[PDB]
Design a protein around this ligand. Sequence first.
Ligand SMILES: *[C@@H]1O[C@H](CO[C@@H]2O[C@@H](C)[C@@H](O)[C@@H](O)[C@@H]2O)[C@@H](O[C@@H]2O[C@H](CO)[C@@H](O[C@@H]3O[C@H](CO[C@H]4O[C@H](CO)[C@@H](O)[C@H](O)[C@@H]4O[C@@H]4O[C@H](CO)[C@@H](O)[C@H](O)[C@H]4NC(C)=O)[C@@H](O)[C@H](O[C@H]4O[C@H](CO)[C@@H](O)[C@H](O)[C@@H]4O[C@@H]4O[C@H](CO)[C@@H](O)[C@H](O)[C@H]4NC(C)=O)[C@@H]3O)[C@H](O)[C@H]2NC(C)=O)[C@H](O)[C@H]1NC(C)=O
Ligand SMILES: *[C@@H]1O[C@H](CO[C@@H]2O[C@@H](C)[C@@H](O)[C@@H](O)[C@@H]2O)[C@@H](O[C@@H]2O[C@H](CO)[C@@H](O[C@@H]3O[C@H](CO[C@H]4O[C@H](CO)[C@@H](O)[C@H](O)[C@@H]4O[C@@H]4O[C@H](CO)[C@@H](O)[C@H](O)[C@H]4NC(C)=O)[C@@H](O)[C@H](O[C@H]4O[C@H](CO)[C@@H](O)[C@H](O)[C@@H]4O)[C@@H]3O)[C@H](O)[C@H]2NC(C)=O)[C@H](O)[C@H]1NC(C)=O
Ligand code: NA
Lengths: 297, 217, 215
Amino acid sequence: VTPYHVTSVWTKGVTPPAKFTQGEDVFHAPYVANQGWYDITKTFNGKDDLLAGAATAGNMLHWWFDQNNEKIEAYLKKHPDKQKIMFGDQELLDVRKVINTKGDQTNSELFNYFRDKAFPGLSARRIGVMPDLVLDMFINGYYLNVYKTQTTDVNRTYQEKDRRGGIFDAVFTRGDQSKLLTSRHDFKEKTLKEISDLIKKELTEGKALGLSHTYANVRINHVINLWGADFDSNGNLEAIYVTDSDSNASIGMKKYFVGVNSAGKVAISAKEIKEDNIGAQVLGLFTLSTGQDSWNQ
Amino acid sequence: CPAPELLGGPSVFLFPPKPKDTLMISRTPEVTCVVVDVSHEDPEVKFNWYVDGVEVHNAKTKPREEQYNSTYRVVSVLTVLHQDWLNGKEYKCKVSNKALPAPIEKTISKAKGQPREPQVYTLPPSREEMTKNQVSLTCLVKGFYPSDIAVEWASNGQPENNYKTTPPVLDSDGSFFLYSKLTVDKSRWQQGNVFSCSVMHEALHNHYTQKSLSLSP
Amino acid sequence: PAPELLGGPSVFLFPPKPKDTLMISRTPEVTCVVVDVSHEDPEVKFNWYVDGVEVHNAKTKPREEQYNSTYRVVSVLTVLHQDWLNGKEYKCKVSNKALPAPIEKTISKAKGQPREPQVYTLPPSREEMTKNQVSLTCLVKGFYPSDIAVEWASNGQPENNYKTTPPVLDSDGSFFLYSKLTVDKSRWQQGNVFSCSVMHEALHNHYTQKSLSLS
Ligand SMILES: *[C@@H]1O[C@H](CO[C@@H]2O[C@@H](C)[C@@H](O)[C@@H](O)[C@@H]2O)[C@@H](O[C@@H]2O[C@H](CO)[C@@H](O[C@@H]3O[C@H](CO[C@H]4O[C@H](CO)[C@@H](O)[C@H](O)[C@@H]4O[C@@H]4O[C@H](CO)[C@@H](O)[C@H](O)[C@H]4NC(C)=O)[C@@H](O)[C@H](O[C@H]4O[C@H](CO)[C@@H](O)[C@H](O)[C@@H]4O[C@@H]4O[C@H](CO)[C@@H](O)[C@H](O)[C@H]4NC(C)=O)[C@@H]3O)[C@H](O)[C@H]2NC(C)=O)[C@H](O)[C@H]1NC(C)=O
Ligand SMILES: *[C@@H]1O[C@H](CO[C@@H]2O[C@@H](C)[C@@H](O)[C@@H](O)[C@@H]2O)[C@@H](O[C@@H]2O[C@H](CO)[C@@H](O[C@@H]3O[C@H](CO[C@H]4O[C@H](CO)[C@@H](O)[C@H](O)[C@@H]4O[C@@H]4O[C@H](CO)[C@@H](O)[C@H](O)[C@H]4NC(C)=O)[C@@H](O)[C@H](O[C@H]4O[C@H](CO)[C@@H](O)[C@H](O)[C@@H]4O)[C@@H]3O)[C@H](O)[C@H]2NC(C)=O)[C@H](O)[C@H]1NC(C)=O
Ligand code: NA
C-alpha cells in the first residue's frame, strides 16, 4: 500500500466542483453556474442529436467570454454592429443574449442558434462538426464548409467571412496565423505518457480543451469538454473531469478514469479501466486559447 | 499524418408506440429502443428501462442481429400501458456497454398540446356514382388535434377492409382533417346494409366514436 | 493529405404544375435546383437536353443565400405542353467546380396507361348543419397519372377556402383524392351552386366541372 499522491490541473478560470456524489453509474458533481465551467445539454429534438462538436465549442466559447469579459464589452461598444448577426432584415443572434443565457444548460442562445440556424441539417445527414472549426468560424469568421473536415488553413484562398459568425473579426482577423486561437491533435497511435504530457501542457498554458472518443459504434464518435485532469507521481493521467452534451442536466461534471486497456489503447470510463471494462479509446484533442496577446494591442 | 473522424452523438435510438396501438385497448403499444452500428468486436449491449424514474423488468430483449453491412443491431421492446402513455409518463432507455465511458440515456414521452375533438361525418355515394359496379362510402374526420388518429370500417358487426384513408391535412384553423373511402359493390349498399366508420383519437370520450352510414335511415 | 469531402452539391429536378401543362394559355416550366452550393465554388453552369438534344431557352435565376451559408441556385426551362404529355425526357446537366464532373438528372412524365378521373360532389352531412360553417366535398378517383389540378367556384367567382388531400394510391393502381370547401352554412342554405373543377390529361379538353347545390 502506498500513500495517495495526485497532481490536479484545472482550466484557467475554472473553480473545481466541491461536492461529488457517487451515482449508480458515475461519480459526478452537479452543475452550479458561475464556477467557470459549462454544460450545454442536448434535448435530442432531431436537430441537435449529433451536434456535440458545436456543443463542446459552445462551452469553450462561453468560457472564452468569461476570460475576455472586459475586452469583449469594450469591443462591442467600439463595433456595435458585431452585437448582432443579421441575415438581411432578420435577426439570427444577439451577442447580448448569448451572454445573459450562457449559464443555461438546455436553453443558451448560443446552442439554440447552432442547432436552429447554423447547423440544423447535420444530424439528418449523420455527420457532425469539428469544434475547432466552429470556433474559427465564430471568432475569426472563417467560412465553414461542413463537408470539409481539415483544420483551418490561414493561407487558404477563400478568405471571406462566414455570415454565421465573425463576431471578433476586427481583432481576430483571417489570414494571420497568430490570430487563430485553435488547435487540434490526433491521439490514435500515441502513448499514455505522450497524451498525458500534452494535456498537462495545454491546461498549464491556459487553453480550454475538448476530447473526442469512441462511442461503441463503427461509424460515429463523441466529443466532450475536458475541464480538469489528475496525474500520478509518474505524471500519467489517472483521471479527467468532463461535461458531456448527451448527459442530462442533473449530472454535470463527471470524473472518468484514464488508463491503458486490455487491447493496449488509452481509454476512459466512469469506472476503472481493468478486467473486462475496456472503456472508450481516446481519439484527439481540441484547444482554444484566450487570444490575450492580441486583445492587448 | 493526422486524420479526422466523425464526431456527433449516439448510435442509440428510442421510438414511440404506433399511434393506433395506443388508442385501441385490443392492441398492445410498445416503446422500442434500438442500438445500431455495433461492431463484431464490441461487447454485449445491456438495457435497463425506467418509467417516471422507476425500474421495470418486462422488456423483451432480442439477441444481436448481424446486418448486410456486417454490423449488429440490438433491440429491446417494452410494452406500455395505454393510459400511462396518454397521461404523459416518460419512458427511459439506458444502454450499458463496456466500450461506452458511461451508459447512454434516452427518454421519450408523448408530445403535449391542446387536444381537439374530431368531428365525424359519413357521406353516402354520389347519385352519379351509381352507374358503376362499386361505389364509394366516405367518412370525413375534421377539427382534430394532434394528427395521430385511426379510422376503421365495419358492417353489421363484420370488419370491412376494402378502404384507404388519406393522410391528415393541416386545415386553415390549425386543426387537421382527413377522408376515408370504403369501396363496396353497389349491390351490397343497396341492400340497405348499415356500414360504420369508427374513429379512435385522444380527444374523444372513451377514445372512440362510431358513425353509421346506410342507404335508408 | 486532405481528408475527403463528406458531401457536396445536390441537384433536384421538378416537373411542371399539372394545370400549366394542360392550359395553352399557361407556360409549363421544368425547374432545376442545386443546393449545398459552396461560397468557394458558387458558380453553376446549366445545360438542358430534350430527348438528348440541347436547348438554349433556360432562364437563369439569381443565386439565393441561405442561413446555413450555402447557395440555392436555380435554372428554369419552359417546355412545350404536348412534348411533356407525349412523354419526352428533360435532362438538367449541372457543372460546378467543387465536382470533377457534371451531375445529370432526368425527369419525364410518369409512364402508364392514362385513366380518366371520375368526379363526384358530396353535400354536407345532415349532422354538420348544427355548425356555422359546413363542408362541401369533391371526390376525384380512378385517375392516372397523379398529376391533377382541382379548384372550386361559384356563380362566376372563384372560391378559395378549400384544402385538397394529396393523391393516394388506390388498390387498382389508380389514384384518388378529396377536396373540402368550407363555406358559411347560410350560403349553402340559400341554394347557391358551388362547382368542383378538375384538370387532367385523360379528360376531354383536359377539364371537367361538377356542380353541388342544396335543392
Ligand atoms: C441548407 O439550407 C437549404 C435550404 O433548406 C431550407 O431551409 C433549411 C433551414 C431547412 O429548414 C430545409 O428543410 C429547408 O428546405 C437546404 O436545401 C434543401 O436541401 C434538401 C436536401 O438536403 C432538399 O430536400 C429535397 O427536397 C425535395 C422536395 O423539394 C420541394 O419541397 C420542399 C418542401 O416540401 C421545398 O422546401 C423545396 O423548395 C421544393 O419545393 C419545390 O420547388 C419546386 C421548384 O421551385 C416547385 O416547382 C415545387 O412546386 C416545390 N414544391 C413544394 C412542395 O413547394 C425532395 O423531393 C427531396 O427528396 C428526395 O431526395 C432525398 C435526398 O435528400 C430523399 O431522401 C427523398 O426520399 C427523395 O428521394 C427521391 O424520391 C423520389 C420518389 O418520391 C424519387 O423519384 C427520386 O429519384 C428520389 N431522389 C433522391 C435524390 O433520392 C429532398 O428532401 C430541399 O429541397 C432543399 N430546400 C430548398 C429550399 O431548396 C440545404 O440542404 C441545407 N444544407 C445544409 C448543409 O444543411
Ligand atoms: C447498417 O444496417 C442497419 C440496418 O438498417 C436496415 O437494414 C439495412 C440492411 C437497410 O435495408 C436499411 O435501410 C434498413 O433500415 C442500419 O440501421 C439504421 O440506422 C439508421 C441511422 O444510421 C436509422 O435511421 C433512423 O430512422 C428513424 C425512423 O425509424 C423508423 O424508420 C426507419 C426507416 O426510415 C426503419 O428502418 C425503422 O425500423 C423505423 O421504422 C419502423 O420499423 C418497423 C420494424 O421494426 C416497421 O414495422 C414500422 O412500420 C416502421 N415504422 C414505424 C413508425 O414503426 C428516424 O426517426 C431517425 O431520425 C431521427 O434521428 C436523427 C438523428 O439520429 C434526427 O436527425 C432525426 O430528426 C430523427 O430524430 C433515423 O433517420 C434506421 O432506422 C436504422 N435501421 C434499423 C433497422 O433500425 C445502419 O445504420 C447501417 N449502418 C451503416 C453504417 O450504414
Ligand atoms: Na450535459
